[PDB]
Amino acid sequence: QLKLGNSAIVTQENYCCAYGEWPNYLPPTQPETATDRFYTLKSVKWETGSTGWWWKLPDALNNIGMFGQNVQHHYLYRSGFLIHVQCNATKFHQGALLVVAIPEHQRGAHNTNTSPGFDDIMKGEEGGTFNHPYVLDDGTSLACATIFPHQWINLRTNNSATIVLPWMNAAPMDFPLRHNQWTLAIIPVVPLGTRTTSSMVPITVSIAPMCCEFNGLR
Amino acid sequence: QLKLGNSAIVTQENYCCAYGEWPNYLPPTQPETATDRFYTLKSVKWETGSTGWWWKLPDALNNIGMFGQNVQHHYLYRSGFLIHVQCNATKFHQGALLVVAIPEHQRGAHNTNTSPGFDDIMKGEEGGTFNHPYVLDDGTSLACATIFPHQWINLRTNNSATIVLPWMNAAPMDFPLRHNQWTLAIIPVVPLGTRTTSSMVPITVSIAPMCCEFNGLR
Amino acid sequence: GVSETLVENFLSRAALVSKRSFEYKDKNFFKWTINTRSFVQLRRKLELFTYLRFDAEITILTTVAVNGLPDLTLQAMFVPTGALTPEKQDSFHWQSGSNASVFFKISDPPARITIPFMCINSAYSVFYDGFAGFEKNGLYGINPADTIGNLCVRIVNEHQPVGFTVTVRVYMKPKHIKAWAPRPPRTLPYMSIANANYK
Amino acid sequence: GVSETLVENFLSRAALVSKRSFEYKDKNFFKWTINTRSFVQLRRKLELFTYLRFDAEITILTTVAVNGLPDLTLQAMFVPTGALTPEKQDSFHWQSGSNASVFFKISDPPARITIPFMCINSAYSVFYDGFAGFEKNGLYGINPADTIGNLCVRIVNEHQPVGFTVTVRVYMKPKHIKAWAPRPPRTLPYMSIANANYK
Amino acid sequence: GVPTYLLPGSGQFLTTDDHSSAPALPCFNPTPEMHIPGQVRNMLEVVQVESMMEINNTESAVGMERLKVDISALTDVDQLLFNIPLDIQLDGPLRNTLVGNISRYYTHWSGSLEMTFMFCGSFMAAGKLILCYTPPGGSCPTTRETAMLGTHIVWDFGLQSSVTLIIPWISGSHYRTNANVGYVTCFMQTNLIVPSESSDTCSLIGFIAAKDDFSLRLMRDSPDIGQLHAAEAAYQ
Amino acid sequence: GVPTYLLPGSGQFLTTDDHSSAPALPCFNPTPEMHIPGQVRNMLEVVQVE
Amino acid sequence: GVPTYLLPGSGQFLTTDDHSSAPALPCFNPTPEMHIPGQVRNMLEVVQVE
Amino acid sequence: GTHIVWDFGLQSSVTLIIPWISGSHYRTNANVGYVTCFMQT
Secondary structure (H helix, E strand, O other), rough: OEOOOEEEEEOOEEEEHHHOOOOOOOOEEEOOOOOOOOEEEEOOOOOOOOOEEEEEHHHHHHOOHHHHHHHOOOOEEEEEEEEEEOOOOOOOOOEEEEEEOOOOOOOOOOOOOOOOOOOOOOOOOOOOOOOOOOOOOOOOOOOOOOOEEEEEOOOOOOOEEEEEEEEOOOOOOOOOOOOOOOEEEEEEEEEEEEEEOOOOOOOEEEEEEEEEEOOOOO | EEOOOEEEEOOOOEEEEHHOOOOOOOOOOOOOOOOOOOOOOOOOOOOOOOOOOOEOOEEEEOOOOOOOOHHOOOOEEEEEEEEEEEEEEOOOOEEEEEEEEEOOOOOOEEEOOOOOOOOOOOOOOOOOOOOOOOHHOOOOOOOHHOOOEEEEHHHOOOOOOEEEEOOOOOOOOOOOOOOEEEEEEEEEEEEEOOOOOOOOOOOEEEEEEEEEEOOOOO | OOOOOEEHHHHHEEEEEEEEEEEEOOOOOEEEEEOOOOOHHHHHHOEEEEEEEEEEEEEEEEEEOOOOOOOOOEEEEEEEEOOOOOOOOOOOOOOOOOOOEEEEOOOOOOOEEEEEOOOOOOEEEEOOOEEOOOOOOOOOOOOOOOOOEEEEEEEEEOOOOOOOOEEEEEEEEEEEEEEEEEEEOOOOOOOOOOOOOOO | OOOOOEEEHHHOOOOOEEEEEEEEOOOEEEEEEOOOOOOOHHHHHHHEEEEEEEEEEEEEEEEEEEOOOOOOEEEEEEEEEEOOOOOOOHHHHHOOOEOOOOEEEOOOOOOOEEEOOOOOOOOOOOOOOOOOOOOOOOOOOOOOOOOOOOEEEEEOOOOOOOOEEEEEEEEEEEEEEEEEEEOOOOOOOOOOOOOEEEE | EEEEEHHHHHHEEEEOOOOOOEEOOOOOOOOOOOOOOOOOOHHHHHHHOOOOOOOOOOOOHHHHHHHHHOOOOOOOOOOOOOOOOOOOOOOOOOOOOHHHHHHHOEEEOOOOOOOEEEOOOOOOEEEEEEEEEEEEOOOOOOOOOOHOOOOOOOEEEOOOOOEEEEEOOOOOOOOOOOOOOOEEEEEEEEEOOOOEEOOEEEEEEEEEEOOOOOOEEEEEOOOOOOEEOHHHHHOO | OOOOOOOOOOOOOOOOOOOOOOOOOOOOOOOOOOOOOEEEEHHHHHOOOO | EEEEEOOOOOOOOEOOOOOOOOOOOOOOOOOOOOOOOOOOOOOOOOOOOO | EEEEEEOOOOOOOOOOOOOOOOOOOOOOOOOOOOOOOOOOO
């Protein structure tokens, strides 16, 4: 069970301390029970031909709850994350998710010289979808994307993945409205498959901001 | 008596530890009774006008026995040699053999700019014959060929020569199918002579690979 | 062989980062905005990581060719972030003392300055997943603190009656490299120096 | 007098190993594949031994002559084994940072680099009794690991309206020579630099 | 004063030197070193991380179809699935990996690799595979009985859905233009057995990491990138 | 700084000198010294062989 | 003598350097330091004044 | 196989130890091996 604040998760079937770092406070206000809670996002309809999904952080949580208020009222933030991705399948679904948390995922548009705009990057609660997940939509390789902190959801073995993100910045505190540190990237490497139905296994993303700090209240 | 493995030599009439080095293992599989045995080659008909004979190692033993299997099945080898050359003459034959073991005997063809091919170098059990033994078939001098490890078979004094070759390479292990470390060169400096017959004194070469190592089995 | 794979030994390499030939009779000088995004060979090494902390060791190598080679004196003033870059060869900003000018000749050994770590933050965000401007017109992937500065090079001499091309090769060797958060090596080719677009 | 016969004192001698005059207006540069097999005087000293372990101390000496001598800047980039050699004077491989370039002038003292021991194995097989290729087309007497590299020298300057010949003398002095398994001195003359053919 | 003389190699710009030079802005204190997570001090730490192989080394495999091998009823009892030519240098299954992109900056590579094959079928799906490390030297096995002889490990997929396959010492660019340093082949052993609700087509994900003995030297440039819009904007 | 002056014989390439020069590839570890048999440290050892 | 070689960045006038140079008038004693009131050692002392 | 190259200078006699056989253990005793001698030189 993963109970932080008021929101709890009774998860029923393994932490990945991202780069071996547990999130601590800065050695500012510290909302410890107001924001440290699982802002469970909408579960995504994972079909067979789904390419992937990306949620930039804290862009995914700028509009949600007490953390969403403390973004649009404060000015800086300092907060690690704890992403609990759970992909509840039966014993008859197959597939593999690379639940990878990419720091500073500067995306790239396909086949144009124009940079991606504000609309193509800052999606929010709805999240994104990989246009070309083999290259992570930044020209790199999915095959080497395990260099980032990651866990595999192999539906043969597990349905869940828990990644504990630290404060990942050169700066001590940064913009939540402009800058997005991490990017929870869930990419189905092996696609979903079962013969009887073109099935769906919804992937629930629950992002608890660990150890929130804030400054600059207006 | 020289008994290694199953093959024995009851030799009946003096080691030359080549460069003072006794062969040891690498500080890999180690066939200690399968390959450490005297692969006695064919005795060579030594007439008066014979120029010499050369056996490149381990090219002479790539087709013979358990060492010949472990060349054509493994990939690298590490093995010293122990060459027992015996030249069984009576007390009426005269002659002198420079039984010299030349490391890295890069041969040269006579009167052409083309390098020697695979056929002119990798002879095998049949061995070779010096086209110009005064220059060792590499442009050097036979007169200075005692700088290599060598023993003399002066038929006045002895009929045998035993040279104990170490692992002679810059590499720790090397190719048996492509590279040939040593070269047992038997060159009659003083030719054979007796008045009553144009005689033959057959020169038996027995090459026991000491301390075989191998890697890369296919 | 575990010591040549050190990130200090992997990245501290004086690769060419800038090469512009300017005539003399940008107008008759050149400024080069110091980025690592210029040549695709050093960039892909530095896009292996997310956060870099390096002192650049800029070595300005100036050649010369006519149309007797003259012995000129050059200036290689480094304009940092915030200070103003010259627009002319004889502007007032070349005379500005607080900028780190270095005065060298063609016939000297090449001028060499060690530009320090000059980010506002603790490391250079090689990839910045954010926006510089506070409106929606701000460009993506440009950290406001990532700016090294500007390397502005002119010929200190007055006008000479010979017309001749001056080719300047700028070699950057990062020093004291601390590198954080490695990334996958980019497989698809680049499309621009400003962003990570792929084709 | 037993100390001048040391192999360190016998072989560490800056003998000429390469000398090629290239014009300027191989096309207007030269690359030299670093072997000891070039000149017959240093080769016979080094064919006294079987296995050599030496650091080469390459000293590039560049002279110049017209058809006032110009003051040029040269590059003497050492392309190791595996890295690619330039085919043109202005190719991209001259800009490659990971190759060990050295930038010098004609009027300077001669450029001097110490190329380290760069065999894959523990010594250079001077004589290799084997084959490089895995087919029967592979050449005899060429160790794949014996390759030092390639010494590629160009003129960094652009085109100048004078036409002039550049003669470059490359002097190699082996250092820290450890030598194994001495051989007879070769009495018959050489026939090629690739092999030990005799006449 | 101090009587000096200039050596050869004076006034040269050797690009690989390490000399302390005059800083452009002395008495300027940079931003202090903050503990950013995940410092890489050594590029071997990048290489030792597992990364997906392109084990579908066939034609018309576009994008993410390269990362998985479909096993199904089409695969026979002992037919074939894949072979992985151990060529970090060459364009193959190991080119686009972390071990195969960092070691294209380095000429000589010498160490033990480590493959990891994760099965990605259903939980009811049973069957056996036969992973066969083949050394350098000879022919690649084409029948499953030829693959019985070398190194290998019969891999059922019930509990253990992942196999660490330690490839032994290689020494890499030590044999030749890197041609062929062996194979890792996988044949069908039994068949693929899925129930009537699971999919008939399963898949394999293959990883490769280098182990802690992996050594790398003689840095060069990578041949991977090679050829920009607004490239002259740094001079504007 | 340190007041110096150039001697005669400055900027010369004397071919028999022994000066430590800048290595072309520093931080490159060569192949380690393996015990190859028959090291000749001294050319008199070649001469004293019959 | 002492065998030296010129580095890159030799004979350059870097304007922000701090090298002890030859004084134009050595053996000239300046006026001694008298205690003038209000020495500013640090420009923050100028800034911290309202 | 098993063997021993036999020059005849000093040693004009060779003890050749045949190993354990167990004889009538394999079958009508047909063939329990050979001792062959070829010319070497």
